[PDB]
Motif scaffolding. Structure first.
Motif, PDB file in Angstrom:
ATOM      1  N   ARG A   3      -3.381  10.932  -5.604  1.00 41.90           N
ATOM      2  CA  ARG A   3      -2.613   9.550  -5.707  1.00 41.90           C
ATOM      3  C   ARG A   3      -3.306   8.419  -5.220  1.00 41.90           C
ATOM      4  N   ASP A   4      -4.170   8.523  -4.222  1.00 41.93           N
ATOM      5  CA  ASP A   4      -5.209   7.476  -3.727  1.00 41.93           C
ATOM      6  C   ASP A   4      -6.327   6.937  -4.841  1.00 41.93           C
ATOM      7  N   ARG A  53       4.930  11.385   2.477  1.00 44.07           N
ATOM      8  CA  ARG A  53       3.659  11.214   1.689  1.00 44.07           C
ATOM      9  C   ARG A  53       3.655  11.186   0.125  1.00 44.07           C
ATOM     10  N   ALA A  55       4.503   9.379  -2.531  1.00 47.21           N
ATOM     11  CA  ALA A  55       4.810   8.056  -2.796  1.00 47.21           C
ATOM     12  C   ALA A  55       4.450   7.643  -4.121  1.00 47.21           C
ATOM     13  CB  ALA A  55       4.015   7.036  -1.815  1.00 47.21           C
ATOM     14  N   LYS A  56       4.792   6.379  -4.409  1.00 52.50           N
ATOM     15  CA  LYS A  56       4.502   5.880  -6.041  1.00 52.50           C
ATOM     16  C   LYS A  56       3.558   4.535  -5.820  1.00 52.50           C
ATOM     17  N   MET A  57       2.164   4.632  -5.840  1.00 51.80           N
ATOM     18  CA  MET A  57       1.542   3.406  -5.400  1.00 51.80           C
ATOM     19  C   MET A  57       1.567   2.410  -6.356  1.00 51.80           C
ATOM     20  N   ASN A  58       1.612   0.887  -5.859  1.00 51.51           N
ATOM     21  CA  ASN A  58       1.724  -0.054  -6.679  1.00 51.51           C
ATOM     22  C   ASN A  58       0.431  -0.020  -7.713  1.00 51.51           C
ATOM     23  N   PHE A  61      -2.927  -0.675  -5.653  1.00 53.26           N
ATOM     24  CA  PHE A  61      -3.409   0.439  -4.850  1.00 53.26           C
ATOM     25  C   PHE A  61      -3.662   1.615  -5.784  1.00 53.26           C
ATOM     26  N   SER A  65       0.414   8.172  -8.137  1.00 53.56           N
ATOM     27  CA  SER A  65       1.500   8.811  -7.621  1.00 53.56           C
ATOM     28  C   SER A  65       1.564  10.132  -7.061  1.00 53.56           C
ATOM     29  CB  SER A  65       2.702   8.689  -8.747  1.00 53.56           C
TER      30      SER A  65
END
Lengths: 128, 47, 55
Positions: A3-4, A53, A55-58, A61, A65
């Motif tokens: 996700r990152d 942890r 999340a759903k990054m915008n 970023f 997800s």
């Protein structure tokens, strides 16, 4: 990691009710005082810090997800137990499977009456 | 240990669902009848 | 089950028992009245059937 790095991931903890037991054994063998049902005090934290942890990054970023599908196991449908209630108050949605529906022929046993999903409208294709 | 009003539908056993359905079917029927009467009155009061 | 499940079930069954006792009393009263009204109707109907079993 996924996700990152702009990708999408799905994680399935199976079960979390056994991570709770392993944590309880650790905590009891370190001599830390027990709590309710002998689980340590930090048994909600244990899960809340873990499911937060997903999340759903915008798009700034990466946009990646990480969906999570924790699996809990109740005892004779006692959803009112300790770990079930903790994780129910941690998660977004729920999918209640019931043995009375499993044997009545309804498989998957999803109890559509109680199953919930906060996102609901959003995250659904227009046809569906 | 005592008993209180509106407990049959608090347990939610078989009697609770049975009572809920026995109520819902009857009031669906009465709602249908009342809607028919409302339509009739609507038509009869246009003039 | 757990304590709350048992408590709710016990309360429901207690209400059901109360209701069935009341209904037994009502039915008994209506039965007494029905027997009282059935005696004369018994003679009347038996008379009305008299003909066919006699002829």
């Amino acid at each position: 990691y996924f996700r990152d790095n702009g990708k999408h991931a799905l994680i399935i903890y199976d079960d979390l009710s056994k991570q709770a037991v392993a944590y309880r054994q650790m905590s009891l063998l370190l001599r830390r005082p027990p709590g309710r049902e002998a689980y340590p005090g930090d048994v909600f934290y244990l899960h809340s810090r873990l499911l937060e942890r997903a999340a759903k990054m915008n798009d700034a970023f990466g946009g990646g997800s990480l969906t999570a599908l924790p699996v809990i196991e109740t005892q004779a449908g006692d959803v009112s137990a300790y770990i079930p209630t903790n994780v129910i108050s941690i998660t977004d949605g729920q999918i209640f499977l019931e043995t009375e529906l499993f044997y009545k022929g309804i498989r998957p046993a999803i109890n559509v009456g109680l199953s919930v999903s906060r996102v609901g409208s959003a995250a659904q294709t227009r046809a569906m | 240990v005592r008993s209180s009003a509106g407990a049959v539908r608090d347990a939610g056993g078989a009697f609770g669902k049975r009572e809920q359905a026995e109520e819902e079917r009857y009031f669906r029927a009465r709602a249908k009848e009342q809607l028919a009467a409302l339509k009739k009155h609507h038509e009869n009061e246009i003039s | 089950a757990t304590l709350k499940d048992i408590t709710r079930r016990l309360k429901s069954i207690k209400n059901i028992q109360k209701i069935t006792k009341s209904m037994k009393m009502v039915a008994a009263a209506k039965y007494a009245r029905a027997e009282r009204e059935l005696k004369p109707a018994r003679v009347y109907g038996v008379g009305s059937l008299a003909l066919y079993e006699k002829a």
